[PDB]
């Protein structure tokens, strides 16, 4: 058991704490310099473990006054070995993050501290920058809206606080470079993650896409918006609520065909009109207005489901965002075009050493074992949990639940106890706020739209009689400090209103009230017609719901409804598990291709003279054309060399260089050798005329432009195949093997096209 | 809007009749035009016989609305203001060392399609020069059309010089003075000086029988 090893390590930490206290200032920075010089002599990271943890403990005492406990040293040494150190919520994990990032950044490689959203990153950045700048290291906060040079200066530091979106987009924009100095990242060394459950389990489903703007079309969107606006709802389109999708009925198809004047909707000529109709219908029905986006300055900003914030850069795909812009008469803008694609699993698997603290990862320990090769070290609490959590109060129809939670927060407001009202969607928080407008209770709503006052709202949410309605921004890492006189009456009565997508998220929301052994109250509230229950509930118990009457003055008391709630939540977790596993084992193939392509692109960026590279590509495409004509299985002396010599004189060589009598039925290897000799002489002429450098820049531009274009076409075709392979699993074969074989064939076609294009662009210019 | 409505591909009918020195010519043709890329792919057929004046002296007479515009010069176009209402253009084309074309064309969306109805009258000619001697190479160069506006006529006056590769090894510098008129009278857009950077390509079809000109052409604008 490694816990005893961590415990005796912590005892050693306390032993060296016993004599490090009497050290004066300015020797701590001298101790950092001493560690830096002693490291490269013969020492490793594990040799300098105890003294570094003791000196950073002493530095924390001298700077911030928060002396780390015994368990935080155990978490730090667990984070050094590369294992997930699951600590319970509110146990002070931030200094536990400061320990091994001070240990591992003495090499000078660079250590990335990753978390979920922006404000949490900035708060941890300023506090641990105040800690680390006393030691003598450089801490650079990475943002979303920085410049290229600001990002370059940030990753040049020792410790880079950043979110996961910015790190992913910086790696992905790090492989669309036309130079080398415009690169922003260092080599990848280390990544201490916070909230590993969310990043590597919850939002590991959605991959990262970068897109540039393509050509713009307009007429189909507004025509489809008018047609969908005249559609009479339930009779003409179905709307399944088990999964968010809509399709036209037969009468809707007849109305669609008689509206646009076409004869058949599902003809192959009218694929664009049908696609626009379907996307406009999905934008008009499935996407509610304030549950999944907002309206800002004529633009549409989508609201992330996982972190709860709004991300100003990321539109939707497949023309869905244009239909949302056409829903409210806004200025429709350009269309997207995929440039690069990476998931979070492969990107964090490139990091070569990583670890991460969390709050609730004990449920997913086998998934952390199978994928990232890590195990979950449970860690004690140093003080017993007094966070009392009552069981759920399941209600009938939703306005009864809102009345009950309004009565609860009213009876708790007149006692001085602060209450954080959790929510999930955005507009329902405003519904609770305007339901609290009557009875006169002051409050600060924390929406996705009111996000700029977040720091003062959060620090003001721990005083006497504070009421805070907050959506998922307050979910993951919001630290609410208990103010004055509040611990007497058991402060921070956290009241949720919706069962979340998984047990970890609402368990974190429950754990928001604990805060180092302080008394808190955690009550939930559910509805029988709630979105989760109506979206994933079992159909057998739906008839039993009407058996309990309808007055909604009291919650239901039954074990059947609790069993149905837990079964529905576990079904949602099972669906997310299946989607995660399927997306990972489908993206493994694209990982294997993408690593090779980025490796060759980075190889041809920093070459002093890549004459041999274009020589090898030209001769490979040349001999492939040589074998494309003149086949082994026909005969000699009927190979039709006129077409081949025309192809050589137009594509590879100049016009007046060759005829049929130059070869006229020779061996193919010697004839491609002769063509290679003439190409070598011509390229020597081009090199001696352009000089050494301008020719190099010219073919570098040619290679990079062609490689980017064909890689974009390949990733688009790969996604188009990825839908069809899930369809293709109908004959009794597993689809993943067929996907791998077809992906390899398309990769070969792409690399043959890349060699042909670079040959015919170098040799004719 | 108007031609912002026609971002997709556009059918192009060209009809030309004309007379030079009492000698008849009649050439027609059909193709496609695109605005978001801004190109013209046109298959043209001489449906009267043989060319009195050759095809390179014809190509500036052969539909200037199919330019490619980047984001900033979207305000500064005239050729999306008179369309779909219709367009009229006449040119004085002075050949140095030879006579003069007066060309007479209306370029308009008839029904849907872009029809260029051209009648060309070429006067002041001596037959023993270069053009009726057919001294032209089968090619056309790259150019810059200078565009300005006049407000007494509220139309567009275009100035440019063009350069024909003569088969003796010389060039015919010939200057176009171009007058550009709306047909409808809606929102007119009269911008400042700018220029169409244009380039062309003349080729043929190996599986076609008669004397036909295949035109492929790129237009871009710049300046404003």
């Amino acid at each position, epitope marked *: 058991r490694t816990l005893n090893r961590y415990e005796k390590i912590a005892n050693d930490i306390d032993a060296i704490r016993g004599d490090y206290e009497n050290l004066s200032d300015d020797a701590l920075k001298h101790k950092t310099i001493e560690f830096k010089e002693r490291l490269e002599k013969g020492a490793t990271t594990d040799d300098l473990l105890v003294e570094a943890f003791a000196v950073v403990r002493e530095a924390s005492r001298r700077v911030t006054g928060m002396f780390p406990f015994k368990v935080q040293l155990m978490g730090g040494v667990a984070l050094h070995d590369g294992n997930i150190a699951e600590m319970k919520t509110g146990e002070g994990k931030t200094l536990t993050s400061t320990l091994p990032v001070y240990l591992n950044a003495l090499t000078g490689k660079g250590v990335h501290v990753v978390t979920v959203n922006e404000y949490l990153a900035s708060r941890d950045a300023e506090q641990m920058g105040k800690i680390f700048e006393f030691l003598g290291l450089t801490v650079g906060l990475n943002l979303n809206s920085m410049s290229k040079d600001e990002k370059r200066e940030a990753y040049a530091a020792d410790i880079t606080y950043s979110t996961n979106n910015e790190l992913g987009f910086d790696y992905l924009r790090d492989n669309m470079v036309l130079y080398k100095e415009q690169m922003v990242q260092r080599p990848l060394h280390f990544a201490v993650i916070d909230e590993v459950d969310s990043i590597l389990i919850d939002e590991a489903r959605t991959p990262l896409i970068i897109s540039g703007q393509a050509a713009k079309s307009t007429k189909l969107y507004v025509q489809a918006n008018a047609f969908v606006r005249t559609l009479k709802a339930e009779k003409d389109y179905t709307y399944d609520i088990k999964t968010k999708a809509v399709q036209l009925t037969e009468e809707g198809m007849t109305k669609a065909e008689k509206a646009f004047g076409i004869d058949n909707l599902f003809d192959v000529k009218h694929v664009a009109l049908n696609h626009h109709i379907n996307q406009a219908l999905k934008a008009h029905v499935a996407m509610q207005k304030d549950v999944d986006y907002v309206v800002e300055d004529g633009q549409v900003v989508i609201v992330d489901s996982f972190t709860g914030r709004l991300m100003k850069g990321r539109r939707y795909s497949e023309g869905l965002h244009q239909a949302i812009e056409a829903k409210e008469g806004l200025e429709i803008q350009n269309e997207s075009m995929t440039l690069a694609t990476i998931t979070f699993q492969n990107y964090f698997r490139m990091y070569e050493k990583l670890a991460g603290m969390t709050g609730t990862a004990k449920t997913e320990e086998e998934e952390f074992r199978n994928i990232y090769n890590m195990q979950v070290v449970t860690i004690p609490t140093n003080r017993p949990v007094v966070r009392d959590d009552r069981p759920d109060l399941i209600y009938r129809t939703m306005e009864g639940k809102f009345k009950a939670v309004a009565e609860d927060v009213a009876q708790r407001y007149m006692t001085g106890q602060p209450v954080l009202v959790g929510t999930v969607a955005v507009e329902t928080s405003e519904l609770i706020s305007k339901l609290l407008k009557n009875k006169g209770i002051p409050h600060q709503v924390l929406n996705a739209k009111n996000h700029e006052r977040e720091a003062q709202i959060i620090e003001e949410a721990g005083q006497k009689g504070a009421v805070t309605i907050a959506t998922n921004m307050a979910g993951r890492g919001t630290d609410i400090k208990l103010g004055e006189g509040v611990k007497e009456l058991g402060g921070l009565a956290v009241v949720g209103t919706e069962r979340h997508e998984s047990r970890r998220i609402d368990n974190q929301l429950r754990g928001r009230s604990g805060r180092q052994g302080d008394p808190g109250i955690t009550q939930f509230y559910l509805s029988m017609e709630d979105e989760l229950m109506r979206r994933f509930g079992a159909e057998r118990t739906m008839a039993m719901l009407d058996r309990f009457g309808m007055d909604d003055s009291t919650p239901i008391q039954s074990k059947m409804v609790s069993r149905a709630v837990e079964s529905s939540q576990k079904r949602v977790e099972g669906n997310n598990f299946d989607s995660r596993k399927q997306l990972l084992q489908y993206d493994d193939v694209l990982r294997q291709q993408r690593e090779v392509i980025y490796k060759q692109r980075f190889e041809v960026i920093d070459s002093e003279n890549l004459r041999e590279i274009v020589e090898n590509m030209i001769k490979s495409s040349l001999e492939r054309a040589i074998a494309a004509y003149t086949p082994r299985e026909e005969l000699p002396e009927e190979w039709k060399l006129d077409g081949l010599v025309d192809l050589i004189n137009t594509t590879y060589l100049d016009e*007046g260089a060759l005829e049929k009598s130059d070869i006229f039925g020779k061996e193919p290897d010697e004839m491609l050798e002769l063509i290679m000799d003439r190409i070598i002489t011509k390229y020597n002429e081009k090199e001696e005329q352009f000089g050494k450098e301008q020719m190099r820049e010219f073919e570098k531009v040619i290679v990079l432009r062609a490689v980017d274009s064909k890689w974009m076409d390949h990733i688009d075709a790969m996604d188009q195949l990825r839908q069809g392979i899930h369809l293709r699993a109908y004959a009794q074969t597993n689809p993943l093997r067929e996907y791998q074989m077809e992906g390899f064939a398309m990769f070969e076609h792409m690399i043959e096209s890349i060699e042909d294009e670079v040959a015919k662009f170098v040799m*004719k210019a | 809007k108007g031609e912002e409505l026609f971002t997709g591909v556009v059918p192009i009918l060209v009809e030309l009749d004309g007379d030079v020195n009492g000698h008849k010519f009649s050439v027609s043709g059909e193709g496609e035009g695109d605005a978001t890329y801004g190109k013209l792919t046109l298959k043209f057929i001489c449906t009267t016989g043989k060319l009195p004046v050759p095809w390179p002296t014809l190509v500036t007479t052969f539909v200037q609305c199919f330019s490619r515009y980047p984001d900033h010069m979207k305000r500064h176009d005239f050729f999306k203001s008179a369309m779909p209402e219709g367009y009229v253009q006449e040119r004085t084309i002075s050949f140095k060392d030879d006579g003069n074309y007066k060309t007479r064309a209306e370029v308009k969306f008839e029904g849907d399609t872009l029809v260029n109805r051209i009648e060309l009258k070429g006067i002041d000619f001596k037959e023993d020069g270069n053009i009726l001697g057919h001294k032209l190479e089968y090619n056309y160069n790259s150019h810059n059309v200078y565009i300005t506006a006049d407000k007494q006529k509220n139309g567009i006056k275009a100035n440019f010089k063009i350069r024909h590769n003569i088969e003796d*090894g*010389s060039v015919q510098l010939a200057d176009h003075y171009q007058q550009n008129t709306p047909i409808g009278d809606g929102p007119v857009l009269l911008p400042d000086n700018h220029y169409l950077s244009t*380039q062309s390509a003349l080729s043929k079809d190996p599986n076609e029988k008669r004397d036909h000109m295949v035109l492929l052409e790129f237009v871009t604008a710049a300046g404003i």
Partner: nanobody
Amino acid sequence: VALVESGGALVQPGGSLRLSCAASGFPVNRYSMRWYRQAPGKEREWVAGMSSAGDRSSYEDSVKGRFTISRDDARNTVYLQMNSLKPEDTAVYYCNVNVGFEYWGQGTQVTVS
């Protein structure tokens, strides 16, 4: 199909020097190559050029009987000449061929003083 040119230097009006322009990517043998010049403030004008594989050669009237455009097929380039020049012909000289598109040289500046 990118023209690279050289041979430009500060010259007296009593000396004769050759102006070279290398053709790269296409043969000299079957295309008409022309020489242009453009002074600072002057518009780019045609000076000389020969067609039909160099048996008939035309020149402008300012250097007619003075200049001579020559070429070599093995060297795949052309040669101009600055015989009997004047300070009026101070310009940046260009070579121009038309193979499908029209490609210009980068420009060789010659100044006379």
